[model samples]
Target chain A: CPVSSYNEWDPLEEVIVGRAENACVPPFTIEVKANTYEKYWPFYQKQGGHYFPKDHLKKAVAEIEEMCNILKTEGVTVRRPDPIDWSLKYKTPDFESTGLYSAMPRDILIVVGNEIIEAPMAWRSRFFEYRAYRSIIKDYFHRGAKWTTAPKPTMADELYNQDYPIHSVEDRHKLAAQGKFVTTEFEPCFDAADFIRAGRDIFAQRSQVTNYLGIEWMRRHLAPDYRVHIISFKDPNPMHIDATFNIIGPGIVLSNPDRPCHQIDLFKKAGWTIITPPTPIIPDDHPLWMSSKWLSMNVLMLDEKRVMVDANEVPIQKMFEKLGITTIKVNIRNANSLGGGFHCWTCDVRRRGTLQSYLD
Target chain B: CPVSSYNEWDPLEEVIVGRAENACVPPFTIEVKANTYEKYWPFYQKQGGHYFPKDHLKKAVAEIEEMCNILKTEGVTVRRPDPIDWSLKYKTPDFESTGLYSAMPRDILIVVGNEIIEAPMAWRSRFFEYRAYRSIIKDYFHRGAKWTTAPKPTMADELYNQDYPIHSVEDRHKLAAQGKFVTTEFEPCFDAADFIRAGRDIFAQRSQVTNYLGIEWMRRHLAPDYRVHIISFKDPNPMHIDATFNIIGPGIVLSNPDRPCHQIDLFKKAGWTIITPPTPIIPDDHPLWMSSKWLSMNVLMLDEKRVMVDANEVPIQKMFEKLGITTIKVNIRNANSLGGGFHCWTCDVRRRGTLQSYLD
Candidate 1:
């Protein structure tokens, strides 16, 4: 029973911190093109299937190591995925591609009650990403934890809309309204990051990687005990839901101001307190290869009273202090280049709390 | 819901019958060597990774088609997996091998109540076999059925005991008794054929393809609603459990005389009738490439009183008739060369019955 996690803001007991070692650039596939900004298109075209800049990877590795140290200093158990050379190529019958890094555990693993589930990711480069974490997961299974893997997708040509319009944000917005995405409903596929969990209810979004079938799979699997709800946001390039809406505590959430939730009234009707953090102040010259400036709001909660915030994003630090929460300052700015903040980089495995409905 | 079955004895409504379109020989790996007969060693050494004899495959395809027609005539809906050229090669990061046919649905899929689970098979060639069934499963999901895929093993070099004493049956007997197998406890790996369903209490075994960890995984996943008990047999070279101990009806089982259950007293104490069938009548010259001749007892129950049995195995057919069960005889002598009889070739998806514990 070492893997018991119910909600996000419970007292932390154990966590699985991701690695930035030997990270590789994903291939410039259509699904990747739709999820990323046009500004990174040239970089992906040049670096696809190769290692990311070694200098940047070095700094990101150091930053994640320091982040792990801080979590252990706060009396929480920490685990890391085995380092892998992600530039190796693999071939399935349906597709062939190189691997992406295991730098975002939140993208693949979700702990519910005493069970840990692995998501069936849509990105072809991430097809074998689960190999890096199997050793740790096997150990968890040996210690009497429930393990389940969602159905893996064969990333064949039919799973992608080969001619999906990726040039216009307006077209993307219109397509989003019609519930169209770069991924077709050829099968069920999703990243675990598309879901933000509460106690008895987990909210997910239909992003570029997540479709209605994927959400429906989770809904039926957790039915009669936990409920899965689909919520949406007004954004053109949606992938993970954490940077857009992070549930921090019981009845409290960090709502991104830029990408407003379409179902905000649902939370309002439940008497929830929504906090909109200030804009990030990371310098414009600094390179963020894979994400927007919203990493400031993707904070991890150690408990109800403590939050892990970026040391560089001082405005968000002040917002947490004003809300009567102590901020644990940790600088993972280089790690943020790998498309995650503290919340995305770690999966809380054992939170010291029981399941309860905050909405009630 | 489109998927519902609790035991083997219910009146069949819908079932998935596997395909033999492109059956190939699995490579003579250590696990395969352990499970297969020594008499076929020379054949595997020469024919591994290639198609089974074309003439044999042609007859198999024809036989299965006739079998499907008979099932339809008997008022059962039969579905087939999408046929693929199973000689194609694929590579994962951990291993590389050619494909295996989806010739046995019971080897990969198991239905319990409303949920259909895809087993994580240990064979390297069978890694991608689930691809053939996704189209069928997705339709079932769309019609409201729970779909789950167990955690797939990486199938690395460490998963198998390379030096396992496959050359000696006495060594295997000692190893099996010591709770050892060709498959190590590297990860949770099991074929659905290792388990036999009997309402609320499902019975599994630790065999060459299924380790103790695999049984533990199933036991934990189905807890609090259904029980998964690990039983054992007195035979060496154990693989699938259906040909060894098959439950045909409520409180009734067809136990192989050559491989008696180690815990037979437990069933006798529960007032269960264990019928030992006569020896199989399959000719010694017939090529049973993948399984033993004990397939005479691997009968599929159409209901409590009707059994689908082999037309060639007349001795066992008389045994069923003597037990007051109507015998619906069908001949698949050529298909039997590709492994599986009636029970092994089909997975019951929908049966008109409810969940009840007969052991109590």
Candidate 2:
């Protein structure tokens, strides 16, 4: 059984690293607009259904390959998704669109103990992204790993709030308080990234791409074996939970200072130590078409004692070193432009550990 | 919960009856070719991707409507799939084809105690058939029914034995004995009709469309709570298990005389009654384009003492009457041309019974 991981911080054994090959900009749909910054709406409108800058993608591919080499050098087995042409158009009964890349495996896959669950992605352009990882997943399944696919949404017009306001931050803030999101309750839909796992206790949020029904689906699926809690934050346009509240160790988490979680008192009462890392060093001129500067905290944990951090984010590297954690630095700045950091770029398949509750 | 069913004949309270509107002929692919009779090869070749004869479909639509009325008369709540144009063509990353109809709910949806599972269909043309049922399923989910979609197969060229010998019955028999099928072990795949449920112990078979991997997937998914056993019959071109081995009640089964179960001794030793159904009375020129005359045995039980028998299949209805079971007859002869009988055309969602092992 090659697929067993209950939490983020476990002794690294085997992992699936995503590819930047044929990365295409998602279509300028309402859901996409809700998640991205207003500055990038023009870029999405112009580049939708086409590949990202070819030279930038080439560099990102090289960076990921080097990252994989570093992982191998560190005694961890690395797996990559099958390279696919994301520009190929597909039409479902509900919608017609091309695909987004498999560059962010964390957004589509989540491992709970021996099972790897495929998320019902919230974006129409990313509907078929699971095809890229099926080859690897099938091999894992053949070796006795439990494979599950969440119910895929039709992504019809009903699933999205077509009139959702995406321009004013004040309106977005007011809507967040009321728990309104771009995705409606038409059907359960969520990106795997909206959930952050802890052994026995996983936390999720109702982001622009994840609705309450989606969280409820995960909660019901995990059942008596695992507890899924709905936690919220103050961000105007929250998407993936990893970049916001990353649980890096048994009782330690990197909590983003900008978008404070409304339920932080729950963790504080449980004696969990919350750490706020230093600000990211990426310049304003740099293209981060898909994410915020908070990706500096979206670090991957090889174990409680080691972390994969950005080579350029020296302040965060120092913060980890000061906490007695070894920092494995590898630059993926080019890859970050596609909206992910070390944690989002890979999905840890097997880790040397046993399931235990840390929330007690 | 809106969904709960343990076995086939447990006093069916609510069921999903399929529709035949806009039913289309599946494309003439390798898997379709292997499952059909040689007499209809030319018909499929010419009509693939096209709607079935409009006049015949009109009759089928009428028959199913009448059948639904009879079920309601028998005090069973009936649900129907939303009308869909099955002639619509769609493409996936692995293959492209038009859709098969939602004429057979038994082929795609299965209920196992509070959970409704969507099968990973074997044929390429039937890839998106689940769309027609999502509206009903979402309502069930919202009302607290567990919903699961099995891992979908890529339907790539590697999944099928491209040169499978479909023209020779002797070759098919040999291949069946050798545990070979048109579908390879490329990925998990099955139609829900290949499985016949009985309380805590369910039986499945490896047919032309259901491979070993598919059976294994179901076995693993339902483990501990339900035991899935693999049983076989002597049929050369096996497709669905309902027509061949229909489990009617506790320790009672309607075994098709033409295709005897190889594991009949197992049931006999367990104190089970294996009744051999009378020969079907269907005329040789009736144009059963998709199934054999054995569909006469594919009766749906409303309860342990009642059955939904075909109006045209009088011989089998006589056998049921002799067994002290009341027969509620309704005819869907034209619908049979689209490949399904009473059991095949409906999925029992709620049966008023608790989970129990009849085998013990």
Error of 2 at B231 (Å): 58
True contacts kept of each: 0.00, 0.00
DockQ of predicted model 2: 0.01
Query: Model 2, A1-360: lDDT tens per residue?
Result: 999999999999999998876688999999888888788989999999988987677667667877887899889999888656688788999999988899999999999999999999999999999988998999999999999999999999999999997596566767877878888999999999989989999999888888888999999999999999999888633589998899999989999888898899999999999998888899888899988888899899999999999999999999999999999999889889999999999999988998888889
lDDT per residue as tens, model 1, B189-212: 999999999999999988989888
Tens digit of per-residue lDDT, candidate 1, span A87-111: 7788999989999999999999999
Residue A54 lDDT (model 2) = 71
In Å, residue B281's CA in model 2 sits off its true spot by: 49
* Ten contiguous residues with the weakest lDDT in model 2 chain A: A165-174
- Identify the runs in model 2 with alpha carbons over 4 angstroms from their true place: B1-360
Candidate 1 chain B worst ten-residue window by lDDT: B265-274
Cα RMSD, model 1: 23.2
Question: What is the C-alpha local distance difference test score of each model?
Answer: 0.89, 0.89
